[PDB]
């Protein structure tokens, strides 16, 4: 281009893969509005959900 | 890196860039991420194209 070298990177995609990640007992996941207070070292949540995957 | 502690990661992170060493002053020094967050959510069935 314009009598100088020109480099083009082309990338295309038509493939997506769905995954599932799980932990096992005695481990669980707490999902929601999780608040961490570093001064009092407290973790608090209202209406979180317990999940595995 | 804050009052909750410092977390570091020694695994590599990949990006596109130009060497720019031994080049003229027109060589861009910015690094480019080829894919963004919307490439994993928006238009899953639609074909995606990236040109650099």
């Amino acid at each position, epitope marked *: 281009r314009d009598r100088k070298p020109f480099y083009t990177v082309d990338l295309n995609s038509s493939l997506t893969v769905p995954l599932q990640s799980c932990v096992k007992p005695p481990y669980m996941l707490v999902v929601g509005n999780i608040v961490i207070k570093p001064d009092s070292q407290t973790i608090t949540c209202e209406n979180c959900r317990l999940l595995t995957c | 890196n804050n009052e909750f502690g410092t977390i570091i990661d020694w695994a590599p992170r990949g990006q596109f860039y130009h060497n720019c060493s*031994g*080049q*003229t002053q*027109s060589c861009p020094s910015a690094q480019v991420s080829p894919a963004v967050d919307s490439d994993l959510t928006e238009s899953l069935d639609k074909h995606k194209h990236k040109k650099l």
Partner: antibody
Framework: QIQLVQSGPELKKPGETVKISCKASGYTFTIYGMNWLKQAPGKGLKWMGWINTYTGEPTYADDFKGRFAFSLETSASTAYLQVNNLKNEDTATYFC??????????????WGAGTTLTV | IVLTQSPASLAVTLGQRATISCRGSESVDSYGNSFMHWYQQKPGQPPKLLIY???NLESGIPARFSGSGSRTDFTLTINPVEADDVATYYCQQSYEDPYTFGGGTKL
């Protein structure tokens, strides 16, 4: 068109200093660096270095690091080459040239008119 | 990187091919481009670039001039030699600081 006009010939003596002007006309001065080239009569060309017209940072070759200074005037689109404590080995023509940009673009298509120097 | 350009002086008559050979101590090929350049300098004048990147004819140069060259080996060709080609030709290297020029070749 792009034209690099240099200063006229000058006469000097050892121990003094010389200021050389090279005004660029026909392109944005801040996007293109300025190169300085030296040619002793009867011999080949030698590359001295270049000045970053976007930041002002000067660079010099391994055989020209000693007593050379690159400066520029952005407002008037002019670059100055300064030689201090002239010696008898400095009798040469000095060229200002615009490189051809791009990948490994250290080759020159537009040259200055020239500036003969004797000391 | 040092460059050796041969012959030091070439004597060719009008209407005959002229060939100049330039070598290098190291390769100058990078990412599909060979960075060897040919200049022409007439006395009292700045050099004018003839062939850039070893194969490309500069704009405004007459079609008589043509360049060619492989890795570390490059050549310049002038088939229809005229009387205005009397000058010195240099092979230049633009791949490494200080981007050294050539010694010269009289013709």
């Amino acid at each position: 068109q792009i034209q690099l006009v240099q200063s006229g010939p000058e006469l000097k003596k050892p121990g003094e200093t010389v200021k050389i002007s090279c005004k660029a006309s026909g392109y944005t001065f801040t996007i293109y660096g300025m190169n300085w080239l030296k040619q002793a009569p009867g011999k080949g060309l030698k590359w001295m270095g270049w000045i970053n017209t976007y930041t002002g940072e000067p660079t010099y070759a391994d055989d020209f690091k000693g007593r050379f200074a690159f400066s520029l005037e952005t407002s008037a689109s002019t670059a100055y080459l300064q030689v201090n404590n002239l010696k008898n080995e400095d009798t040469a023509t000095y060229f200002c040239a615009k490189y051809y940009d791009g990948y490994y673009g250290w080759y020159f298509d537009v040259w200055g008119a020239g500036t003969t120097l004797t000391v | 990187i040092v460059l050796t350009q041969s012959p030091a002086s070439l004597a060719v008559t009008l209407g005959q091919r002229a060939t100049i050979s330039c070598r290098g101590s190291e390769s100058v090929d990078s990412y599909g481009n060979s960075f060897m350049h040919w200049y022409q300098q007439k006395p009292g004048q700045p050099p004018k670039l003839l062939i850039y990147r070893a194969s490309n004819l500069e704009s405004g140069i007459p079609a008589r001039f043509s360049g060619s060259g492989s890795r570390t080996d490059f050549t310049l060709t002038i088939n229809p030699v005229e009387a205005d080609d009397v000058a010195t030709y240099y092979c230049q290297q633009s791949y490494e600081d200080p981007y050294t020029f050539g010694g010269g070749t009289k013709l």
